[PDB]
């Protein structure tokens, strides 16, 4: 579905992003989709990732 080449697939699966690529919080931290401990704890203090 991603329309990516195999090398691009390997590259995307080796960088974990540190779970920092999340923006929205409601619905209980997006039902754990966004890492709770890091993202939600940070952004309850006015820290957002655009």
């Amino acid at each position: 579905p991603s329309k990516r080449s195999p090398i691009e697939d390997l590259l995307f699966n080796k960088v974990t992003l540190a779970d920092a690529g999340f923006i929205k919080q409601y619905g209980d931290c997006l039902g754990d989709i966004a890492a709770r401990d890091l993202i939600c704890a940070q952004k309850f203090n006015g820290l957002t990732v655009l």
């Binding site: 409601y26 704890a41 309850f44 203090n45 957002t48």
Partner: protein, 50 residues
Amino acid sequence: QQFGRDIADTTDAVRDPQTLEILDITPCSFGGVSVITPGTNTSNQVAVLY
């Protein structure tokens, strides 16, 4: 123990002094608001991004 705590020394839970039940505290909704404007020279309409 009467009060929980979080990374930022913020109380994430509290024991009810009467029903002895533990309640989680979460801050209520907040976020930035942006205004998309096509320029006053063009129109006075605006869109709002929450």
